[PDB]
């Protein structure tokens, strides 16, 4: 009943297996960073992300060329061992909170099985891994060994509250949109959270409200992991497929468009802004991509590496993509099974559904306005638990989401910056 079987301490000695110094592949040149394998295929790097983007290596603000008023900078955050220890325990606690629900158990299972496809070969007859879906692990003897992985949680770059999904691209293949998948780096912090307003009219108005209620960071992480699920299955929607927000006078007075991928990931009523014709266009597109993967696996007659047999890897991708196998070992895609897997990843795994499972208060739509950012500490169980988040059972915080009420539960939240009015 435990997703993370070891309670890591940041200062635990390296062992070259699940506590190790690692380099992420072909990223110019970097110094190895201490990393922690918290589950099969999932690693945590308690560092500010100065690696995945060469354009983002400085931790203090740009020349405000692209200064979003919804932003927060602190060059010193996550620079000390105590902070990295607390980041690691916070992230592991949120994974346990997610895994404690049926929906999060299902989502994390999909993610672990969502191994990025072995589509690196130039010969149709051979199956080969794609380099950028691995990390390099320093072994006890000081040499590097390459390890495939699906997901890395890393600390944010310069902008602390811009949680972004980063994955390494291909020269020709669009790995997050062609059914293949790729290793996903999520910038994320458990040490901050956002305020929202409990009345829809106030929450969706840019001039009103200070952010009375705090978002549960388990919801925020689950939201990022939903994107990671889409991207690991290669079914993310192109970010320039957008909704011209015509349902909010403030959104449209500015030129505000919101990606279909975000509306999908929130779910509930937001996903209805993706119209039936284009939704079907997407499902057919991804259905064809899975067939191309079935064609590639059929055409494969050799393996590369000594890490697995050919039809071991064939069975790995038969299980990931839920392919049918005929009496001749030829793979095909069954529409019923495809529609079911696609729907699980896109309609069942949503922010709105996670809200139901956690029984928290949350924004009612993605089409709102940020209110505030708070400093928090979820590591102590007197503050936050796996089973209750902030709304601790058998206290004054159990009822009416009083734990998320930053006015009632004020010692758990320090307001760092207001956003209302800045729009
Ligand atoms: S997967 C990260 C993409 C941008 C962050 C986000 O999900 N915002 O809702
Ligand atoms: Zn999102």
Residues belonging to the binding site are: 223, 227, 262
Distance 224 CA to ligand 2 centre (A): 6
Resolution rounded to one decimal, in angstroms: 1.9
Q: Is the CB of 370 under 6 A from ligand 1?
A: no
Output the residue whose Cα is nearest ligand 1's atom 3.
164
The answer to whether the CB of 290 falls within 8 A of the CB of 335 is no
Q: Is the CB of 18 under 6 A from ligand 1?
A: no
Distance 25 CA to ligand 2 centre (A): 25
Q: Is the CB of 162 under 6 A from ligand 1?
A: no
For ligand 1, mutation pick of 165, 238, 256 (most atoms within 8 Å of CB):
165
Distance 164 CA to ligand 1 centre (A): 5
Q: Provide the number of structural domains found in the chain.
A: 1
The catalytic site residues sit at 224
The answer to whether the CB of 233 falls within 8 A of the CB of 111 is no
Q: Is the CB of 164 under 6 A from ligand 1?
A: yes
Domain that includes residue 137, residue range: 1-423
HEC profile of the chain: CCCCCCCCCCCCCCCCCCEEEEECCCCCCCCCEEEEEEECCEEEEEEECCCCCCCCCCCCCCCCCCCCCCCCECCCCCCCHHHHHHHHHHHHHHHHHHHCCHHHHHHHHHHHHCCCCCECCCCCCEEECCHHHEEEEECCCCCEEEEECCEEEEECCCECCCCCEECCCCCCCCCCCCCCCCCEEEECCCCEEEEECCCHHHHCCCCCCCCCEECCHHHHHHHHHHHHHHHHCCCCCCCCCEEECCCCHHHHHCCCEEEHHHHHHHCCCHHHHCCHHHHHHHHHHHHHHHHHHHHHHHHCCEECCCCCCHHHHHHHHHHHHCCEECCCCCEECCHHHHHHHHHHHHHHCCHHHHHHHHCCCCCCCCCCCCCEEEECCCCCCCCCECCCECCCCCCCCCCCCCCCECCCCHHHCEEEEECCCCC
Distance 166 CA to ligand 1 centre (A): 10
Measured CA to CA, the distance from residue 180 to residue 234 in angstroms comes to 5
Q: Give the pair of three-digit tokens for residue 402.
A: 């009083």
Distance 329 CA to ligand 1 centre (A): 40
Q: Is the CB of 163 under 6 A from ligand 1?
A: yes
What method was applied to determine this entry? X-ray
For ligand 1, mutation pick of 153, 262, 263, 370 (most atoms within 8 Å of CB):
262
Output the residue whose Cα is nearest ligand 1's atom 4.
164
Atom number, ligand 1, closest to the C-alpha of residue 266: 9
Output the residue whose Cα is nearest ligand 1's atom 1.
165
Q: Is the CB of 294 under 6 A from ligand 1?
A: no
Using the CB atoms, write b or e for 314-334: b if 16+ within 10 Å.
Answer: beebbebbbbeeeeeeebebe
Q: Is the CB of 56 under 6 A from ligand 1?
A: no
């Amino acid at each position: 009943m435990q997703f993370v079987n070891k309670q890591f301490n940041y200062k635990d000695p390296v062992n070259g297996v699940d506590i190790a110094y690692i380099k992420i592949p072909n990223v110019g040149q970097m110094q190895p960073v201490k990393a922690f394998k918290i589950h099969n295929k999932i690693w945590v790097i308690p560092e500010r992300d100065t690696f995945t983007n060469p354009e983002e290596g400085d931790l203090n603000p740009p020349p405000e060329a692209k200064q979003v008023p919804v932003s927060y900078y602190d060059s010193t955050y996550l620079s000390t061992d105590n902070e990295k220890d607390n980041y690691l325990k916070g992230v592991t606690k949120l994974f346990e909170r997610i895994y404690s629900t049926d929906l999060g158990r299902m989502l994390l299972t999909s993610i672990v099985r969502g191994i990025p496809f072995w589509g690196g070969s130039t010969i149709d007859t051979e199956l080969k891994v794609i380099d950028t879906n691995c990390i390099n692990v320093i072994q006890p003897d000081g040499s590097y060994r390459s390890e495939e992985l699906n997901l890395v949680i890393i600390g944010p770059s310069a902008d602390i509250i811009q949680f972004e999904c980063k994955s390494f691209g291909h020269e020709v293949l669009n790995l997050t949109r062609n059914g293949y998948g790729s290793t996903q780096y999520i910038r994320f912090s458990p040490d901050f959270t956002f305020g929202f307003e409990e009345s829809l009219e106030v929450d969706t108005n840019p001039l009103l409200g200070a952010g009375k209620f705090a978002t549960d960071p388990a919801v925020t992480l689950a939201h990022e992991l939903i994107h990671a699920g889409h991207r690991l299955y290669g079914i993310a929607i192109n970010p320039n497929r957008v909704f011209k927000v015509n349902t909010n006078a403030y959104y449209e007075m500015s030129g505000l468009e919101v990606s279909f991928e975000e509306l999908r990931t929130f779910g509930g009523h937001d996903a209805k802004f993706i119209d039936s014709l284009q939704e079907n266009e997407f499902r057919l597109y991804y259905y064809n991509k899975f067939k191309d993967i079935a064609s590639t696996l059929n055409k494969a007659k050799s393996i590369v590496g000594t890490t697995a047999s050919l039809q071991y890897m064939k069975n790995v991708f038969k299980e990931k993509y839920l392919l049918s196998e005929d009496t001749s070992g030829k793979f095909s895609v069954d529409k019923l099974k495809f529609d079911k897997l696609y729907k699980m990843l896109t309609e069942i795994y949503t922010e709105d559904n996670f809200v139901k499972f956690f029984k928290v208060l949350n924004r009612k739509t993605y089409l709102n306005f940020d209110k505030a950012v708070f400093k928090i500490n979820i590591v102590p169980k007197v503050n936050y638990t796996i089973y209750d988040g902030f709304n601790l059972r058998n206290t004054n915080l159990a009822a009416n989401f009083n734990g998320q009420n930053t006015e009632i539960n004020n010692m758990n939240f320090t307001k760092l910056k207001n956003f209302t009015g800045l729009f």
